[PDB]
């Protein structure tokens, strides 16, 4: 649930 998706094809967590 921590997912931060910053832009196309970019995931942290």
């Amino acid at each position, epitope marked *: *649930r*921590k*997912r*931060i*998706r*910053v832009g*196309p094809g*970019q995931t*942290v967590y």
Partner: antibody, heavy 124, light 116 residues
Framework: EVQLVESGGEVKQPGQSLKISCKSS????????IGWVRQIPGKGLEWIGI????????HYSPSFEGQVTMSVDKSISTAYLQWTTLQASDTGKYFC?????????????????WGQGTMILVSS | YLLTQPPSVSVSPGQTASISCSGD??????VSWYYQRPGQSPVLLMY???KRPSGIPERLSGSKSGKTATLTISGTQSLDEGDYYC???????????????????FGEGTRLTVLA
């Protein structure tokens, strides 16, 4: 009523310590990031940082780091911002906010919830 | 990086206003926009470039092109006056390790005047 309720505005002398809070209800507190944003009267929006309530993982903006501490108390759905020593440049209205994880075949995040702000005026 | 917005835009009621938000990494970074009336808390208008969260009217639409995102308000009424902010993120790993460091960035905001 999903919402964020912050603590009262306050006047402080420089040198003093400080702790404002931000209280959560209406959704699952541990699961969404909390960010902090400052706004000097008449000025734009400035990012302070974000904190994950579940694990206290934290991200800080350079110009705030080491000057201000984010923390959360999980047992009371409450997030904190605190200054060990206050400066005049610390003046502003402080917003807490919930980063929401929107989902789809292309997920992402935006700050969809905002506390009402906490006015902090530092002055001799 | 930083987000550059026009300090102010003026529009006659019933016409269309565009608010631009340029930035060097914005061509691989989702952009969100926020409204804020003087005195009140900011409110989310748009996220992931062009998507409206529930309750925001169709007459508002976001877009992006190259290193410039845009918010567009058609049918501008007086109540639309106020400050508009774009925002995006940065994510980079530090040269010496320790995971991805996130940055939240905001444009300096655009004040919208509607000439009634």
């Amino acid at each position: 009523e999903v919402q964020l309720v912050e603590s009262g505005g306050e006047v402080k002398q420089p040198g003093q310590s400080l702790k404002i809070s931000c209280k959560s209800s209406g959704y699952n507190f541990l699961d969404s990031w909390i960010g902090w944003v400052r706004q000097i009267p008449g000025k734009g929006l400035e990012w302070i940082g974000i904190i994950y309530p579940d694990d206290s993982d934290a991200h800080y903006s350079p110009s705030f780091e080491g000057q201000v501490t984010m923390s959360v108390d999980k047992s009371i759905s409450t997030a904190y911002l605190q200054w060990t020593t206050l400066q005049a440049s610390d003046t502003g209205k402080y917003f807490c906010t919930r980063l929401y994880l929107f989902e789809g075949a292309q997920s992402s995040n935006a700050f969809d919830l905002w506390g009402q702000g906490t006015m902090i005026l530092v002055s001799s | 990086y930083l987000l550059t917005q026009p300090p102010s835009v003026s529009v006659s009621p019933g016409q269309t206003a565009s608010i631009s938000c340029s930035g060097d990494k914005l061509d691989d970074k989702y952009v969100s926009w926020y409204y804020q009336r003087p005195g009140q808390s900011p409110v989310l208008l748009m996220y992931q470039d062009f998507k409206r969260p529930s309750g925001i009217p169709e007459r508002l639409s976001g877009s992006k092109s190259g290193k410039t995102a845009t918010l567009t308000i058609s049918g501008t009424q007086s109540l639309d006056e106020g400050d508009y902010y774009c925002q995006a993120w940065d994510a980079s790993t530090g040269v010496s390790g320790g995971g991805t460091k996130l940055t939240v960035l905001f444009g300096e905001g655009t004040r919208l005047t509607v000439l009634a």
